[PDB]
Design a protein around this ligand. Structure first.
Ligand SMILES: CCN(CC)CCOc1ccc(/C(=C(/Cl)c2ccccc2)c2ccccc2)cc1
Ligand SMILES: CCN(CC)CCOc1ccc(/C(=C(/Cl)c2ccccc2)c2ccccc2)cc1
Lengths: 236, 243
């Protein structure tokens, strides 16, 4: 599937997009913050596995490596999705269409408003850059392929082939991002510049995931961080 | 006035601003298993940080920022910058980390402190990736300046007119480093496709470097020691003389 043209790559990613889910609270009852966020994330994760298997090249990998990639990336992917759908809602986070929250509403869990603030800034940055949908799906696929690629625990022949593949798929997505920017009329300089600005935002998204992963682990709750086996059970 | 700088001028500036490679301070005539490995890394890092401040002030456009914003950027970036330095000078030493010329450690030596072999393994993998990519010195200095300028830019948390202007400037300087990276690549004869593919490959490694810094910072905080540089320390070091 690295024979795909740039336009075929975009279409495939656009097709693979997960749906927008709703929060599960009774809207007729008075308005747990973590509870709502957790159920939302749970349900999104199932759809994320579905999406991942539709990212060109992903199912070419071993099941083990697919799990490793998702294990490393799942919160980054949830967060970029959140930031994307929040883009046109300054100062708020659209967790769900029935759950649009501001930073003050985040101040009811310790350490949450700090995370909310980081997400809001990323959304602002997306707005400034006028991030497009076709660019977003590319960046999201890059996260899936990239975040875990430096932490493969082996140098077996197969693992070398797997890493080679991952980097070839990533190069294809780079080629596609550039194409999108060419299609929109950006100059060559502008193209490289925007590529860089987009990819640099991924470091901040990594950062936000790390801070959030710290929170989930501090809870000392058994099922809160997805196990290898859960991911394995879903992917197979 | 560093936005007028050319691509070759930008590289030259950055190469000239490079900090020195420091040596570990242990008595080499003394038994090795005495020394605390966290002790050695901490002292090395302390000394490196001073040189980092002076390097930062020589990154084109960095001293055009407010002192508060300079501090914020370094507060965010300092461990990423130490780590990319480490990974760079380890590039030519497979399976080892060259903390200093007289302190070249493997992953087994990192098993000294619990939780540290995991970080060593990530650093080693980064170094291996640099090796695979045949990372050049001029590309290295560009990436390191990008880390300095980019890592804290999303967390200023001021929307004053001044802060807007500061962020605009940071992104203009970043754009210029991007132009510089591309120029280097075109100079080396890479096709346009190869140029944008390698730019992306290099920038994606920065996310893993962020990751490594976060895991490292988790450790330093876990110690419950003054081991994380305070704002006031960074301010004290940056807010200097000219006497
Ligand atoms: C295995 C079961 N797990 C993961 C699915 C339960 C899910 O735990 C959570 C997963 C994600 C989030 C979350 C955010 Cl922003 C968050 C993370 C950490 C600390 C504070 C906030 C978020 C929720 C929805 C969309 C985007 C982000 C919260 C709990
Ligand atoms: C007192 C304030 N700071 C000074 C920065 C002290 C900060 O202590 C340390 C700073 C850096 C390192 C360090 C590594 Cl790789 C590390 C970090 C966390 C856990 C395990 C290892 C490193 C050292 C030198 C070069 C590259 C990396 C260790 C202690």
């Amino acid at each position: 599937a690295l024979s795909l043209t740039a336009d075929q790559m975009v279409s495939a990613l656009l097709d693979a997009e997960p749906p927008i889910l709703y929060s599960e609270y009774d809207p007729t009852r008075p308005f747990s913050m973590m509870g709502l966020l957790t159920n939302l994330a749970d349900r999104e994760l199932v759809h994320m596995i579905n999406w991942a298997k539709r990212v060109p090249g992903f199912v070419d990998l071993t099941l083990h490596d697919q799990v490793h990639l998702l294990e490393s990336a799942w919160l980054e992917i949830l967060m970029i999705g959140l930031v994307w759908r929040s883009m046109e809602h300054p100062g708020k986070l659209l967790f769900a269409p029935n759950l649009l929250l501001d930073r003050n509403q985040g101040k009811s869990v310790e350490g949450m408003v700090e995370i909310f603030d980081m997400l809001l800034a990323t959304s602002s940055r997306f707005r400034m850059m006028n991030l497009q949908g076709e660019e977003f799906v590319c960046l999201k696929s890059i996260i899936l392929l990239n975040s875990g690629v430096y932490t493969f625990l082996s140098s077996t022949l197969k693992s070398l082939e797997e890493k080679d593949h991952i980097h070839r798929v990533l190069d294809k997505i780079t080629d596609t991002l550039i194409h999108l920017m060419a299609k929109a009329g950006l100059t060559l300089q502008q193209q490289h510049q925007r590529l860089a600005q987009l990819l640099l935002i991924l470091s901040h998204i990594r950062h936000m995931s790390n801070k959030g992963m710290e929170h989930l682990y501090s809870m000392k709750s058994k099922n809160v961080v997805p196990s290898y086996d859960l991911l394995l059970e879903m992917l197979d």
